[PDB]
């Protein structure tokens, strides 16, 4: 009989479980118990460049001064930069406003400023969006290197309306 706190019975599982290695499951042979072993340091795959500026207080303002956006005008006026701001950013920062968000109303954690207060260039978003400034985190795990620049053009349009 079928219970709900345990999976149901099966009739001759010929090809149900895996012989190959589907990505996130557990195995026995590997270094850890995982199945997601880390790549070697210093290597470069096809279609990716490493970011050449180090962490904050010495590489922050060096990235703020001389670092530019490698996009074109066909890609900026597409609306895809707004959709990424609709997902990953309204939870702390405001959607049309700045700092109002969804979570300083509920008072879960405080200390989110506006965009009038801090002057930010188009290369100073990209250094914070990959590393975080003391209360953010690395959003490089979520967004890709083509897509952080699509967000940075949209944030500049939000400061100009303020």
């Amino acid at each position: 009989c079928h219970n709900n706190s345990a999976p149901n019975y099966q009739y001759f599982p010929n090809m149900y479980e895996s012989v190959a290695y589907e990505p996130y499951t557990e195995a026995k042979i590997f270094k850890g118990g995982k199945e997601g072993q880390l790549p070697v340091e210093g290597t470069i795959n096809r279609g990716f460049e490493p970011y050449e500026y180090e962490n904050s207080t010495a590489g922050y303002e060096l990235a703020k001064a001389n670092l530019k956006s490698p996009l074109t005008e066909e890609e900026k006026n597409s609306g895809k930069g707004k959709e990424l701001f609709e997902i990953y950013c309204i939870s702390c920062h405001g959607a049309a406003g700045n700092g109002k968000g969804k979570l300083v109303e509920r008072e879960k954690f405080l200390g989110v400023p506006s965009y009038k207060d801090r002057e930010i260039t188009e290369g100073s978003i990209f250094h914070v969006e990959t590393y975080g400034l003391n209360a953010m985190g690395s959003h490089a795990n979520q967004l890709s290197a083509h897509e952080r620049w699509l967000v940075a053009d949209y944030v500049l349009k939000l400061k100009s309306q303020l």
């Binding site: 709900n4 118990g33 879960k108 985190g137």
Partner: protein, 221 residues
């Protein structure tokens, strides 16, 4: 007496066939996760957007479980939970002594606010499974076809613990392909096909019986 004999024979058939049709089905499956994670506080009360934690739905075929780096950039500043969130079943001290288990998996220390060097991953329990002859891909099935994120896995924001909502048994994949439309307005891949046959045959086509999405080599090869 033959009338009731027939009745019982009909009933007997009903309670055998019905059984056999519910063998390979895993509806309403609920295991016990090692943490008590709640999709209800995060996705329902805080209105965290659905693509934030599950980020690989746009690009890859496996919209995977979010790694423990997403569990820190929100939870560097949230140590305690609240005072108006504990319920009749769940207390505040149940939550505060269990959010500390997230700090042991990563290595965070509450006192001096710094990472240690001892990490252990969290062994989650996967409740949605298919056999590995099928080929389902979340990427061209959410981003290409604009399907809302509650019409395949249920109203996920109103769940304290996670529940499988649909049955996934080969006649739900076909049935939702019979009654839907491909999106041909925006894609330039369909300009050769959609500008054709509006002059010739018709205005729009369904997914299954028109584009060819019912063939034994497109789903399990």
């Amino acid at each position: 007496v033959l009338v009731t004999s027939i009745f019982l024979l009909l009933a007997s058939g009903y309670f055998v066939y019905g059984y056999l049709m519910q063998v390979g089905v895993d509806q309403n499956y609920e295991p016990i996760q090692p943490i008590h994670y709640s999709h209800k506080i995060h996705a329902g009360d805080n209105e965290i957007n659905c693509k934030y934690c599950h980020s690989a739905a746009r690009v890859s075929k496996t919209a995977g479980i979010p790694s423990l780096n997403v569990c820190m950039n929100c939870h560097k500043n949230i140590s305690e939970v609240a005072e108006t969130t504990a319920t009749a079943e769940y207390s505040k001290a149940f939550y505060d002594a269990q959010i500390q288990k997230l700090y042991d998996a990563v290595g965070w220390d509450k006192t001096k606010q710094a990472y240690t060097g001892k990490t252990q991953p969290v062994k989650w329990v996967r409740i949605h499974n298919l056999p590995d002859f099928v080929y389902f891909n979340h990427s061209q099935h959410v981003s290409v076809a604009g399907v809302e994120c509650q019409t395949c896995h249920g109203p996920v924001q109103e769940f304290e613990i996670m529940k499988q909502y649909s049955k996934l048994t080969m006649g739900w994949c076909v049935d939702c392909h019979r009654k839907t439309d491909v999106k041909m307005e925006g894609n330039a891949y369909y300009e050769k096909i959609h500008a054709e046959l509006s002059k010739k045959y018709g205005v729009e086509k369904l997914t299954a019986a028109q584009m060819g999405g019912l063939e034994c080599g497109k789903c399990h090869y």
